[PDB]
Amino acid sequence: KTTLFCASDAKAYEKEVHNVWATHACVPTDPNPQEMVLANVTENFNMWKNDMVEQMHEDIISLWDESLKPCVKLTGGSAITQACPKVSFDPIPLHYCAPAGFAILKCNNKTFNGTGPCRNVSTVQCTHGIKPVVSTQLLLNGSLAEEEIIIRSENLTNNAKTIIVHLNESVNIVCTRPNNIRQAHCNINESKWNNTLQKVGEELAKHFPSKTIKFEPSSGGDLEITTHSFNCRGEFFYCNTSDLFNGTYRNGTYNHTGRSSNGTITLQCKIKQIINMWQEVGRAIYAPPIEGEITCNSNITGLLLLRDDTETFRPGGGDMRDNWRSELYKYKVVEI
Numbered sequence: 391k392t393t394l395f396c397a398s399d400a401k402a403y404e405k406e407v408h409n410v411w412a413t414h415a416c417v418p419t420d421p422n423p424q425e426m427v428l429a430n431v432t433e434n435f436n437m438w439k440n441d442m443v444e445q446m447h448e449d450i451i452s453l454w455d456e457s458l459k460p461c462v463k464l465t466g467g468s469a470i471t472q473a474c475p476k477v478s479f480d481p482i483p484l485h486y487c488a489p490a491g492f493a494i495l496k497c498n499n500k501t502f503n504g505t506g507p508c509r510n511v512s513t514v515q516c517t518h519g520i521k522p523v524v525s526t527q528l529l530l531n532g533s534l535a536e537e538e539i540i541i542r543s544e545n546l547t548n549n550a551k552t553i554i555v556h557l558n559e560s561v562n563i564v565c566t567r568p569n570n571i572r573q574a575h576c577n578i579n580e581s582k583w584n585n586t587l588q589k590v591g592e593e594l595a596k597h598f599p600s601k602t603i604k605f606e607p608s609s610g611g612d613l614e615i616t617t618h619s620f621n622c623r624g625e626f627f628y629c630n631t632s633d634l635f636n637g638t639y640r641n642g643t644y645n646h647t648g649r650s651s652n653g654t655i656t657l658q659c660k661i662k663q664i665i666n667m668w669q670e671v672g673r674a675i676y677a678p679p680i681e682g683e684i685t686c687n688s689n690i691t692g693l694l695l696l697r698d699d700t701e702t703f704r705p706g707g708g709d710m711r712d713n714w715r716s717e718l719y720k721y722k723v724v725e726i
């Protein structure tokens with residue numbers, strides 16, 4: 391183990407909260423980072439048991455703690471209140487670096503699925519730039535798989551283990567609350583989504599011999615996980631995906647059965663004030679949404695799934711440590 395530090399291009403003149411936090415909590419990234427390629431070496435990685443994930447998790451928690459102040463914060467029977475000003479919120483890439491005396495192993499096997507042996511290895515001082523994007527169901531503004539779609543699980547046969555799909559082509563998603571002040575919506579091109587679930591259906595079909603692979607909405611639970619929740623400019627969006635995860639893959643073909651219109655799937659969204667915290671068990675209450683057009687144009691770079699004659703997969707999430715995993719799976723902290 392170690393104590394990693396972070397590096398970023400945070401502007402000290404920037405009011406945006408990620409910048410304000412990184413400037414005081416992080417170090418300036420290196421303008422030209424080099425890696426140290428290695429042959430005749432193979433190392434084992436376990437994305438599911440990586441301490442780097444917990445360290446980033448802890449930073450993002452303190453980053454949010456300092457950045458997003460909820461009016462009220464309830465933990466059972468006790469409540470804390472404070473000023474909760476609206477802020478400039480837009481994630482920036484964070485780099486994680488090993489201190490003097492340690493390094494960071496980097497798997498270069500472009501098909502490596504997070505766990506097991508990795509032949510093509512390398513050594514770096516810092517990870518690549520990772521946007522600490524908090525969301526469920528859909529992974530946003532992340533990196534793409536270089537060659538084909540990659541299915542990641544701590545155990546695939548264990549239907550309780552979250553599955554991380556690493557897309558090799560991003561699907562664009564635009565969410566907007568137009569200038570009901572809490573009513574918003576997202577647009578997704580159905581063509582891109584059809585192709586996405588077609589491929590994803592194939593990669594899954596593999597792993598699961600010959601079964602009718604269905605995609606359905608989250609069976610139930612808190613809104614944070616039964617919908618695609620995320621933060622857009624500080625506002626907490628909860629977007630319905632019952633028309634997104636709605637289809638079936640059989641006989642090597644995908645059929646989207648979710649509603650769509652002129653080739654665009656739209657998610658009905660709801661900007662909420664009361665939010666079940668991901669940082670800890672509790673509820674945070676924020677002020678009503680700011681005025682004007684609130685829009686976030688993002689890229690879907692991965693999916694979070696949970697499997698139930700037909701296998702059924704549903705959108706998952708909730709443990710933000712999986713969001714960090716989807717980018718940190720390549721890395722491993724090692725000693726010198």
Ligand SMILES: NC(=[NH2+])NC[C@H]1Cc2ccccc2[C@@H]1NC(=O)C(=O)Nc1ccc(Cl)c(F)c1
Pocket residue numbers: 524525526612614615619620621626627665666667668669670671672673707708709710
């Ligand atoms: N209920 C809570 N108190 N905390 C528990 C977390 C941890 C966990 C693990 C699995 C499934 C769900 C959860 C709980 N997660 C959240 O409530 C959650 O993820 N909330 C959240 C909150 C805001 C945004 Cl933008 C978002 F994407 C998510």
Ligand SMILES: *[C@@H]1O[C@H](CO)[C@@H](O)[C@H](O)[C@H]1NC(C)=O
Pocket residue numbers: 503504505506507541542543545546597
């Ligand atoms: C990923 O690859 C490893 C070998 O490195 C294998 O043991 C494991 O079953 C694979 N995981 C999945 C879910 O396909």
Ligand SMILES: *[C@@H]1O[C@H](CO)[C@@H](O)[C@H](O)[C@H]1NC(C)=O
Pocket residue numbers: 536537538539540558559589590592593
């Ligand atoms: C993306 O990955 C999927 C994996 O199933 C593959 O089918 C598709 O051809 C890939 N696209 C590329 C490599 O351009």
Ligand SMILES: *[C@@H]1O[C@H](CO)[C@@H](O)[C@H](O)[C@H]1NC(C)=O
Pocket residue numbers: 545546547548549
């Ligand atoms: C994964 O889960 C299945 C079913 O729960 C179990 O039989 C299997 O032992 C698990 N695999 C590992 C390597 O733990």
Ligand SMILES: *[C@@H]1O[C@H](CO)[C@@H](O)[C@H](O)[C@H]1NC(C)=O
Pocket residue numbers: 613616617630631632
């Ligand atoms: C999503 O929208 C559908 C269609 O109205 C609805 O049936 C379902 O209850 C919604 N899901 C959630 C989590 O509210």
Ligand SMILES: *[C@@H]1O[C@H](CO)[C@@H](O)[C@H](O)[C@H]1NC(C)=O
Pocket residue numbers: 605606607632633636647648649
């Ligand atoms: C698929 O979408 C349709 C149209 O919105 C909806 O009526 C149906 O309930 C969905 N199927 C599910 C939720 O599995």
Ligand SMILES: *[C@@H]1O[C@H](CO)[C@@H](O)[C@H](O)[C@H]1NC(C)=O
Pocket residue numbers: 580581584644645646650652653654
């Ligand atoms: C995918 O969606 C597009 C856009 O509406 C549509 O033209 C096409 O028929 C769909 N194909 C599949 C496989 O669902």
Ligand SMILES: *[C@@H]1O[C@H](CO)[C@@H](O)[C@H](O)[C@H]1NC(C)=O
Pocket residue numbers: 480481523530531620621622685686687688689
């Ligand atoms: C994703 O990145 C884009 C480009 O910077 C940004 O406009 C968008 O708001 C981001 N989405 C989220 C959810 O942070």
